[PDB]
Amino acid sequence: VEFNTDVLDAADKKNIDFTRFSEAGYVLPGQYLLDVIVNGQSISPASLQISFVEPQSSGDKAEKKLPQACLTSDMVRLMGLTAESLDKVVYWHDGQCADFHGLPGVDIRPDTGAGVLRINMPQARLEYSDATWLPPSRWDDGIPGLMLDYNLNGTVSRNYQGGDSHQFSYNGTVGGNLGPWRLRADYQGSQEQSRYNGEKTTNRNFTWSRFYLFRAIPRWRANLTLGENNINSDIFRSWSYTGASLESDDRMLPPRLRGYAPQITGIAETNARVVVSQQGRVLYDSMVPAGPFSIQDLDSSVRGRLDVEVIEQNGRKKTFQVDTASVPYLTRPGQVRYKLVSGRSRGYGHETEGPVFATGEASWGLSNQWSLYGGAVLAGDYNALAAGAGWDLGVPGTLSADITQSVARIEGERTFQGKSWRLSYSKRFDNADADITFAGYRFSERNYMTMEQYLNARYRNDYSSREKEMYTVTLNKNVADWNTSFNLQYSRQTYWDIRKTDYYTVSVNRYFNVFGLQGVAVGLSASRSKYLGRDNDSAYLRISVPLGTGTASYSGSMSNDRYVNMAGYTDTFNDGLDSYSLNAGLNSGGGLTSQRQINAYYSHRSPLANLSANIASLQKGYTSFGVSASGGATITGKDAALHAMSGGTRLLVDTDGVGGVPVDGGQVVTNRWGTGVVTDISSYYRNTTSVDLKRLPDDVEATRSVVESALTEGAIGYRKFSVLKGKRLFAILRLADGSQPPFGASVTSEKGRELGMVADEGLAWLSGVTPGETLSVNWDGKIQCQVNVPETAISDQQLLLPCTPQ
Template identity: 45%
Template structure:
């Protein structure tokens, strides 16, 4: 802080001196950019021993190379080496050399790029070639400030950068994991069971390529007369992918699931090139799938697709809503809610997307080829190829379609979409399939689909989706064909062949009523099995009663009917603030013929921990449970315990985290999405620095490294130092940096942090004199730690015992000082520091 105050003081003196010279005629200007100080206004004992050279030339930076962050129109980007050179027409000046690589990341329009001129052997941008361009360096903040008129820049908004600014990140290795364990004891049977399950992603980043291997494991033990034990470990998927930014697409090689808005998903090994909605501005992106439901007790929710675990998470009793699934997930998802008493709820969620609309003149596409495979990586079908497109025909109209074909199977689809503006968007399509089976011969049929959606971007909280689909008995998806092909003795209609489906998802907030509602409904019929229904309805309202404020009343009703198993329930919740940060509430539920009433209390502990305790009655049995969550620097941990008198007791623990290792260092950390994008933070070797993105902060490790995992792909993300939590003996020259990373990237941000004590000192030269007024003191990292005042006095910050610092004036290193081996904060006298030349 001292160096900033000192520089501000010099700036004020500069202005005072300049004003005095105008009035008194005591100051002349050698050049338009040069400033001569009237030192008479300075209260100094020795006016002949002054060095204000670094302040006398506006914007002057000593020629050389500096590590500076780029602030483009007040948006800070990654630090990089910036060279300052003396222009040909001004040998005493200096100017930042903006290389072609740096200029490419500005996101200039094609017209602006054509008018650029260069100097210094065409290596540096001529700053006068772009009208209105301003460049200013601040070494105190280690930042190069660049201002460019918006008319010369590609489209961007507050949360999105053009592709020219996307970063591929560092090469590195990632090891992400999620582990869960549960122990259950059934009192009546005297049996004790435990499960240990886990899943994760191991991977490596090489330039723009992301190499990923997914795994899952489970151990089940039943302590009964049979002592049943089952164990499994599987590598579920091997894949590699990269962004093709020029096409706004993702190239994937290896094992994958078909990502399609037209055809049903299935597993295959091969390659795909798919337009990635995440590369579009936020208002043009599609919906990410979400899963909702109600847990009767503390439970584990397992979301899978075709046997592959996508998400495992512990949830407290009551309604849950999981919204952090990958937006690339499509098709039907299988959901299991494993309750504390050992019972399991099962249902499916269809992740249908919004109507396939495209901006006028643009084309979005999805291409793939390969061979279908099963969960054991075995080929189960013929080579296929598929392609689909969406073309923005005109303003408001889109045409889309595609084809999927292989040996003995083919499907064609054609559809049209219309943007109804304030009324939403509507699309309709028809798909025809043709398949040949050895036992049934040729089968063909049609599937019709109608979809409607409306999204309210202003609040980003209200989404409507509705759809209808009908498939006749002859229609077969690729998954249906593969199933029928493996069952030659069947009738050609595989188990689970869809007939008719209705879907509706709606959420609305009524701000004037302090009320919100959410509805999710799906109805599915099949050709060879019973119908499946699922709905969730939640209504919530905030209100006040007397001195009690922000009381929340919510009612959730649900029905699940899947594989002839029906589960109905209702859940009532009433909660109110209690104390400074706690919540007291009542919960009542009716599920599976059981009535439960309970009182619960939840609160947080600091910024990273929260807990819930609950006590009540289930029918006539006492019911107790607790839930604890900790968002730590190294991992996210959740724990739960449940007890019901005379029936069961259960405890569970989950832990999710990861390790990231790069050439710049690495750290253990918690994860947001397995194998996802993250940012490695370098705090200049200082441990315990609190850094973060949008979630809770994490602390840098003993090597001064931390990983922030809550970073979105292709989205401008900010990482920051929480200065409110920064230790008293540390300070940061800058506290916020921004950037946009490609999917799966390991970004890198360096924060200049000065750590150490503060003390007043007096610097003496070998002959007994003192350094000139205005001389600077820098540490081994070239961080400025103080500016010499009158009589050699200096207030030093960031000092450590035995540290060696350099004193500079006349734009050169003059001598070095060595700090004492013991520095006491309570020192009342100035430290005498001899300055010696070495």
């Protein structure tokens, strides 16, 4: 219980809801906004729907129990519990309080004073998720529509012999995605026209360069591929083809499961208990096995001392200093990688076909830091078998080698068979920065035929370009004074019965400052191509000193008796996001001519599309002024929009009605229809889309800003914004008899929304009132009266209101 009912500044002694709300303050059965936090992290930064009701399930003699959070099914399904393991929330309805009678050890503390909802529970009941390692639940992939992104340039020109000005670039990648299956077709075209005195010629070209469709699989972690493309050069060279392809995608796996750091190989006596702390927080406390142990489950971020403290079974202890550099390798044991490609070959034309193949390329690592890789390319008339391993020996570096047994039966009856071996070598991070990052050695014979060579000799019949044997190495070494990373290099080639053309390239990178700020980078290079009689000595020179909004740039270059000079003042604007390039130049050729060029440019990052202008004028080539249009668009989604160039992912922010709201990320502003789209985002990340809260105009306001979702590549995420206005008013509620109701009673809305309470003289200042509804006032544990607010009411008014019972 009983509180002090008498001590209050009130002329009226009607306080039946004053003792009741105070006493009811354990768990309040009302509707508020709380943030559900599970084991420290949160599943929702802006959880609005949090309901509380009194439970009438458990019958009792006194019926005095504690009410809990009357959760619905959306926030319990977006949290990530293993619902197929333990089914204790799949049978509960929204009418009654979700009781926790089936599982032990979890306590809930609902505090509306702090605006949070803490839940502490063990890891054995649920799965794991964070900003990294998103769950396998499908995200917002609905109504993809079409996606266009143009990049066109219109410009003028003039030559030394008269003038002609009609030049147009025409490229873009349009395509329409359909659910998980996503399509994109890049067109290629142009527009040329020249107007001289005695001749008026023009030509137009357009072709379908590359049209492609794709779909990703989260179950097998591989992306399917149908159409025309090129394969990167791992062992074999690059080549065009048409058909199916099963390639890699390792975006879903966590870095603790991907990367593995080497652990302590200390073998003292038994199944001990390790304790490792960084700043006074144990990051790992578990039971290791008997004898030798190795914890590769910990690859987190460390930036200091970590005291590895061991607790043995008898009670023995040992302390030693481990470094912060825990040397994680690039080899991955236990994980395999594969390329399952098949189809037909693409020539140079658009309708150029060829033979049918079936290719298998795979790699496998054993868990002794050794790793094999085998390739089986099989066509209808050409077969090549590849196999090989790779391993890191630790202190002498790392090595890898492979053999390629190829048979080639051409149409002209000439069977050629060869087994070629290539070896790769490298080096770890040494003490004096000795770093051989690559060292190759390719053994070949005159009897070879690669797949590209098989297709050119089979139809175009060329019998040249035969390579015999060579070696290369890549050493780079820095020193801890003068900031210079020395990279002296040498590469050597030789063909079958054609000469060598051996190369010689050196480098030195100075970095210091005299009579200016630090940031002056002077990298210098010099190259030499040694033939039997010719040695072309080329060298590049530059002077570059920045001052933030100014940068004096110079460029010197001389390949073979042609020294070229440049002079510029290129930098950004005061905001830092706008820019312009300004530079002059001098050209001295070997054929007794001195040429000069002057080029000017200015850009502008508009949110609808990026635009720019250029001025180019040289000696004998005149007045080439240009203008560029580049941007992007998305039609037939939820609404049409316009944006700046994408590379695979876009999220759709929906702020209807407001034309000028600035969002973060790329500072895109919305349109008259009220839709927007951000561009700089990445797959499987924590994307916090908040608007520029202090850059809002005075016509609109913002209730809440933070919405959270994780997008993938090629999907469009829809984000609904619940920001609306609220009217505030003072309403004098009067009862049927004329008397006033006891003040302190809270008013709930029709949709389950608590807004405030009644003051002393039957007055209730309320904010956020929608005009036209019928409100509800609650005292003594039930609904007592209803009033009907008219639609003519606006904000900040004094209204006398009559009470009507339900």
